[PDB]
């Protein structure tokens, strides 16, 4: 029963502790050192303008109430004490619907150093909205943000900061790329302030730069569309006496242009403006129709 010393230490720490007041309430500003480690960048749902990402959202601050003197210098703890002590109420500004994985136990981690420093990490899957400008589809690129900050605590009370150099804070795993359409080029952190009716709040933004891969859209739309324009074009080598062959070739051509057009348009999200693929389909179809009407007047 050597654990009696440690349970005495923990009971002493929680005796009179108030987890409802931030540390240093009437003395200073609470400084929260935040970190993110992307275990896997989830697929980007283009249809909903969102993207998925799995992170070990790591934080650290300093509570002077939780100092201790014991044989061991770091208390690694069962993660249910995080409910028993103050933690900052960080929330994702653009988070749509995120889940903290509770399998098997709560995927949470709490460490208390001798000096009173805390290290509260959590695993979770963020689902954040990425507003896209699909004018250059499928040659487009996006900077999908990830903005987070404290709810209900202003800039004068809870200020967020990066734990390491900002270039080296948000780290992505090597094989952690579940993407299949896009590719991940780089990360971009930024720290800023947002003004609101209730006051000022610190906001840390992370942008992930993405470039869409053209390889599948070359095969699906552009190559069939070029071949179909050529299929219009070989009508003109056909003669003027065999009118039924040329007219059926033309009407079949505009038929396959129509079905290719709606097939291409079903893939994209519905948008209120014309994209590059849409312009390509429209121009190439205009060439198909121009070939048909030139055959007609011939």
């Amino acid at each position: 029963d050597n654990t009696t010393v440690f349970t005495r230490i923990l009971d002493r720490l929680l005796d009179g502790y108030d987890n409802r007041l931030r540390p240093g309430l009437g003395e200073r500003v609470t400084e929260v050192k935040t970190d993110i480690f992307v275990t896997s960048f989830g697929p980007v749902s283009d249809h909903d303008m969102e993207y998925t990402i799995d992170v070990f959202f790591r934080q650290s601050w300093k509570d002077e109430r939780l100092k201790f003197k014991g044989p061991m210098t770091v208390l690694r703890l069962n993660n249910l004490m995080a409910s028993k002590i103050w933690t900052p109420d960080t929330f994702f500004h653009n988070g749509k619907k995120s889940v903290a994985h509770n399998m098997t136990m709560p995927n949470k981690l709490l460490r208390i150093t001798e000096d009173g420093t805390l290290l509260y990490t959590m695993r979770l899957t963020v689902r954040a909205e990425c507003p896209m400008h699909l004018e250059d589809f499928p040659m487009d690129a996006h900077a999908c943000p990830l903005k987070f900050g404290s709810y209900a605590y202003t800039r004068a009370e809870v200020v967020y900061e990066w734990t390491r150099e900002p270039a080296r804070s948000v780290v992505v795993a090597e094989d952690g790329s579940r993407l299949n359409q896009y590719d991940l080029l780089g990360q971009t952190v930024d720290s800023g302030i947002v003004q609101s009716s209730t006051g000022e709040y610190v906001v840390m933004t992370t942008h992930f730069h993405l470039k869409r891969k053209i390889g599948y859209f070359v095969i699906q739309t552009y190559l069939p569309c070029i071949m179909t324009v050529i299929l219009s074009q070989v009508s003109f080598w056909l003669n003027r006496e065999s009118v039924p062959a040329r007219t059926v070739f033309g009407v079949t051509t505009v038929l396959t242009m129509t079905t290719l057009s709606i097939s291409a348009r079903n893939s994209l999200p519905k948008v209120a403006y014309a994209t590059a693929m849409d312009w390509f389909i429209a121009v190439c179809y205009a060439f198909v129709f121009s070939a048909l009407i030139e055959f007609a007047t011939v």
Epitope: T117, V159, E161, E165, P166, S191
Partner: antibody, heavy 117, light 106 residues
């Protein structure tokens, strides 16, 4: 709150020199410590940085090997030691800590290393 | 290694007029460009933490502009104590400084 350093030093070339930077009014483990040199009428040049809480250290790719940074968690002291020096690195060496937005808010007093015969 | 290009290398101006400085970043740095004043035979003193945020104790005449790479420090009515060496330095990556800017009265 305030960073004090050692006084100016006069050393011969090819020797080794050790600078001190003691902190008062706070504890070094909660913030990074930086070492910056400024030549006489040239701009600032960053040497390296030490994490006192962990002991991890990083160096400029033109100061690797030459300069080494160490810390003493008792004295709230940051130590800069340089191995071998030529007849160009006679400059004021500043000690500073990270501030609010990763800015060097508090700096030392400056220690001018001098070289002659 | 991010390199900071600061302009102009020296200047001269009269009391009580607008003066604007410039610091340019080779790579991206979000808002982590800090400006430091250094009077002759004095340690550097921080003015502007990050991009466009005044430090404690600084007067209200000083102010800076923030962007991805282009950073400018502007001063309004200039008093006679501003003769000093002003440096810009980033902190998005491992910290680096520019050449500096030297202010003179004439």
């Amino acid at each position: 709150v305030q960073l004090q350093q050692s006084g100016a030093e006069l050393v011969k070339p090819g020797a080794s020199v050790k600078l001190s930077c003691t902190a008062s009014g706070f504890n070094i483990k909660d913030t990074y410590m930086y070492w910056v040199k400024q030549r006489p009428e040239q701009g600032l040049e960053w040497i390296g940085r030490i994490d006192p809480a962990n002991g991890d250290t990083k160096y400029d790719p033109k100061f690797q090997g030459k300069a080494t940074i160490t810390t003493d968690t008792f004295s709230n002291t940051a130590y800069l030691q340089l191995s071998s020096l030529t007849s160009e690195d006679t400059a004021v060496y500043y000690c500073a800590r990270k501030g609010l937005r990763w800015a060097m808010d508090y700096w030392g007093q400056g220690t001018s290393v001098t070289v002659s015969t | 290694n991010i390199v900071m290009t600061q302009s102009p290398k020296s200047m001269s101006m009269s009391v009580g007029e607008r003066v604007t400085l410039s610091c340019k970043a080779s790579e991206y740095v979000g808002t982590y460009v800090s400006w430091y004043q250094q009077k002759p035979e004095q340690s550097p003193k921080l003015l502007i933490y990050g991009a466009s945020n005044r430090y404690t104790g600084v007067p209200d005449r000083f102010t800076g502009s923030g962007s991805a790479t282009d950073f400018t420090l502007t001063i309004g009515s200039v008093q006679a104590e501003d003769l000093a060496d002003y440096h810009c330095g980033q902190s998005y990556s491992y910290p680096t400084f520019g050449a500096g800017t030297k202010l003179e009265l004439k």
